Amino acid sequence: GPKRIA
Amino acid sequence: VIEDEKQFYSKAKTYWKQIPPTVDGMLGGYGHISSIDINSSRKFLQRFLREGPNKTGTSCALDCGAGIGRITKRLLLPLFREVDMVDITEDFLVQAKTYLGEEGKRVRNYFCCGLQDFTPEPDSYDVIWIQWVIGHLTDQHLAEFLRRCKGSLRPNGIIVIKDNMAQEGVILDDVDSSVCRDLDVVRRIICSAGLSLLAEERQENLPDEIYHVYSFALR
Numbered sequence: 110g111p112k113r114i115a
Numbered sequence: 116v117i118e119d120e121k122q123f124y125s126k127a128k129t130y131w132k133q134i135p136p137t138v139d140g141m142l143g144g145y146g147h148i149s150s151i152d153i154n155s156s157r158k159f160l161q162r163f164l165r166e167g168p169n170k171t172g173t174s175c176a177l178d179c180g181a182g183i184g185r186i187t188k189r190l191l192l193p194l195f196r197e198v199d200m201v202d203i204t205e206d207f208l209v210q211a212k213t214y215l216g217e218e219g220k221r222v223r224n225y226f227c228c229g230l231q232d233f234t235p236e237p238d239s240y241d242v243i244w245i246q247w248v249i250g251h252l253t254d255q256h257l258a259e260f261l262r263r264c265k266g267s268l269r270p271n272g273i274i275v276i277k278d279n280m281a282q283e284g285v286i287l288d289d290v291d292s293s294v295c296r297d298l299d300v301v302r303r304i305i306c307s308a309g310l311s312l313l314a315e316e317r318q319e320n321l322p323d324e325i326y327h328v329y330s331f332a333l334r
């Protein structure tokens with residue numbers, strides 16, 4: 110899935 | 116970036132074994148974008164299925180990293196007569212039989228395999244869909260897998276990659292044991308597989324806070 114910017 | 120290759124794969128397998136076999140489990144809490152994702156995917160793909168000169172066929176597709184079948188259910192089964200799925204996580208393939216419902220009767224094979232170990236059968240697929248899974252392979256295994264996919268395409272068939280792109284370089288996610296690569300790295304690995312880039316699109320209208328998502332159509 111998509112990922113929140115770290 | 117990947118120090119120990121065996122641990123890169125084993126940590127990811129362990130992570131996915133305990134994720135709920137649900138849409139929100141597939142998308143890490145982003146279940147609310149699933150339909151937005153699928154709608155863009157459908158518009159990106161449908162161009163190639165138009166009658167046109169060298170039309171891509173509609174007999175069979177392969178969904179790689181398919182999970183419970185989120186994409187198989189709402190993108191691929193409505194467009195292809197038969198679909199095969201491949202995923203490493205046994206619990207997701209078991210749940211897919213229930214999640215896909217009645218039209219899931221048209222899923223032929225539920226392959227349980229890591230893509231790094233999987234060989235799609237020659238001359239089998241009009242479309243090979245690879246979404247949100249390339250970050251679980253090493254660079255070399257990704258290039259080798261893409262070459263094997265090329266050999267399994269029917270005439271006029273395509274491979275589609277849809278994934279997250281990093282701003283710069285390669286970023287390892289220690290939670291799920293995956294890498295996020297920048298666009299230039301991804302394009303380089305695609306080219307190295309001997310694939311031509313036919314279409315490319317950055318997805319719109321996704322949440323502000325997530326990495327950019329790109330789709331690539333290849334053959």
Ligand SMILES: *CCN(CC[C@H](N)C(=O)O)C[C@H]1O[C@@H](n2cnc3c(N)ncnc32)[C@H](O)[C@@H]1O
Pocket residue numbers: 110111127131141142179180181182183185186201202203204207228229230231246247248251252
């Ligand atoms: C968003 C992350 N996907 C969820 C399912 C599907 N891609 C979607 O709904 O968009 C990750 C899926 O990738 C499977 N997976 C992890 N690692 C591998 C390997 N090495 N080979 C094949 N599949 C893999 C996960 O189990 C998950 O279903």
